[PDB]
Design a protein around this ligand. Structure first.
Ligand SMILES: [Cl-]
Ligand SMILES: [Cl-]
Length: 543
């Protein structure tokens, strides 16, 4: 009896099941394949295709009518028909479903709760779901889902929440309360989590701990004994390594930590790591040059047992144990733009990138962050000449439209000039590449850039400070160099909070280059400060 395949999980693709329709000549099995395909189309976020395929279902037998209802209730939950979904589930004899069918029952039930912003209930549904799951990966996904729901719940409600006689809910409430009570004390949280596992040894999360909490269970406080500083301090890039070094030492202050400096322009990164290793050094800052960083990435076993805060990030950057990437990368300024534009209400962002490798990498960075906030791709378009943007804008000027463009100051001046008569009220966003002292001394540039807002480091907020004037004068007024000094200062901040940054999720630091945080690849993200050209001045707006 092939109809029983609806009681087991459907692990194949929708394309697989549809393609079995032609190969099946028994009408009863075709309806089964349509049901199997229709319920995976939802997992593939094709609800309207799933519903359309259910309307094609003709004569069904009671076993098929049952699985049809589960999908009908899952579709309603996806269409935010919460009242309908509930009344459709309750109409099913819950004792007639299989464990796989019960997991879909409660998953729909959890989706309804989440739609209504009822986190506690959503957790209670996934507790029932978990009891009916068998695949380890399905367990893990449910565990992490449950932890996401608990983490998004109101902290005040959690502290005042009863287990309701449900042991599994108890174990969860204890876990999330410990996290909320001790995340700012990561050493104490670790001690709580280890104790949680011994308080609820038979709890589901005790066997499969949430992935966010795996790095915290065995957390360790950062304790830097000595540093190796890898920078280009001679030849090409000397000004870059010297300026970065200047910030690092000023942030260093009266620290007793010995810092052994290595000049990467006088030695190979291969031998530096060797010297550092024999030297007992277990903590490196740098290198800076992308080519030097790729040496480590060409054989990550070189930094075995070391904590490395690279001062750059390359396309080959990835997740390596005890490696973090802190660069002034235009990819981060593009991600901060996706956050800024989203908060400002933009929903049709137009991204103009240069037609080069950098433009594709920065444009992808924006798209990724926009997919998270909006669940859709951004309209990226590369340009040969700044004029090409004028055609790009006038053809996609939907509602709540805004432009993002990475380009030199002189190039942006052209873009906003050609876009004046085309979209006079256009909202324009740019990166730090738009702001330079060699161009902020103008009246035409600042007048033909009025209204434009751009990201840059927070250090430029206070231009009347002693440090700014002392640094601004010594650097010759070159913005790019000041950004390197700041970077060197923040590298000291980062290296001493390396473990927190690497193992504490959401950990944020207030540095001179922005709000520093790490993603899953310990790629140091920067929440940029946003300034806006208002007539003749530069006014901070956000962060
Ligand atoms: Cl399934
Ligand atoms: Cl370097």
């Amino acid at each position: 009896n092939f109809t029983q395949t609806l009681q087991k999980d459907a692990n194949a693709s929708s394309e697989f099941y549809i393609n079995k329709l032609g190969q099946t000549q028994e009408l009863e099995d075709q309806q089964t394949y349509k049901l199997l395909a229709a319920r995976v189309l939802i997992r593939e976020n094709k609800v309207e295709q799933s519903a359309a395929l259910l309307r094609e279902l003709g004569e069904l037998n009671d076993a098929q009518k049952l699985d049809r209802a589960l999908i009908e209730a899952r579709i309603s939950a996806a269409k935010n028909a919460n009242e309908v979904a509930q009344n459709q589930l309750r109409a099913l004899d819950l004792n007639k479903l299989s464990p796989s069918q019960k997991s879909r029952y409660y998953e729909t039930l959890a989706i309804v709760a989440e739609n209504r912003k009822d986190m506690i209930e959503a957790v209670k549904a996934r507790i029932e779901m978990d009891k009916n799951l068998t695949d380890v990966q399905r367990h893990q996904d449910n565990i992490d889902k449950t932890w996401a729901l608990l983490r998004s719940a109101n902290t005040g409600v959690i502290n005042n929440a009863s287990d309701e006689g449900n042991a599994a809910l108890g174990g969860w409430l204890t876990l999330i309360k410990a996290y909320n009570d001790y995340i700012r004390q990561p050493v104490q949280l670790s001690q709580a989590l280890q104790s949680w596992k011994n308080a609820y040894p038979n709890h589901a999360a005790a066997t499969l701990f949430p992935k966010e909490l795996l790095t915290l269970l065995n957390f360790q406080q950062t304790n830097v004994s000595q540093i190796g500083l890898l920078l280009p301090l001679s030849g090409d890039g000397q000004i870059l390594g010297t300026t970065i070094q200047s910030g690092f030492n000023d942030a260093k202050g009266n620290s007793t930590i010995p810092v052994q400096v290595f000049d990467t322009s006088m030695n190979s990164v291969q031998d530096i790591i060797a010297q550092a290793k024999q030297a007992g050094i277990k903590t490196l800052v740098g290198p800076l040059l992308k080519q030097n960083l790729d040496v480590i990435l060409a054989d990550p076993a070189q930094i075995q047992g070391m904590d490395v805060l690279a001062l750059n990030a390359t396309p080959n950057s990835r997740a390596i144990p005890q490696l973090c990437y802190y660069g002034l990368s235009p990819e981060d300024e593009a991600e901060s733009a996706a956050n800024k534009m989203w908060n400002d209400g933009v929903r049709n962002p137009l991204v103009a990138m240069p037609q080069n490798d950098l433009g594709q990498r920065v444009g992808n960075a924006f798209n990724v962050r926009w997919q998270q906030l909006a669940g859709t791709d951004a309209n990226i378009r590369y340009y040969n000449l700044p004029a090409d943007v004028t055609y790009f804008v006038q053809e996609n000027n939907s509602n709540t439209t805004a432009l993002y463009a990475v380009a030199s100051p002189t190039e942006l001046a052209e873009m906003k000039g050609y876009l004046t008569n085309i979209v006079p009220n256009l909202a324009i966003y740019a990166s730090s590449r738009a702001s330079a002292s060699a161009t902020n001394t103008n009246t035409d540039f600042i007048a033909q850039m009025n209204g434009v807002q751009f990201s840059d480091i927070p250090f430029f907020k206070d231009t009347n400070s002693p440090q700014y004037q002392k640094l601004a004068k010594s650097t010759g007024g070159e913005y790019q160099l000041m950004r390197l000094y700041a970077m060197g200062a923040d590298a000291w901040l980062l290296i001493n909070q390396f473990n927190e940054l690497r193992q504490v999720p959401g950990y944020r630091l207030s540095g001179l280059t922005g709000i520093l945080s790490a993603d899953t690849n310990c790629n140091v993200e920067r929440d940029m400060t946003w300034y806006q050209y208002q007539d003749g001045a530069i006014v901070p707006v956000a962060n």
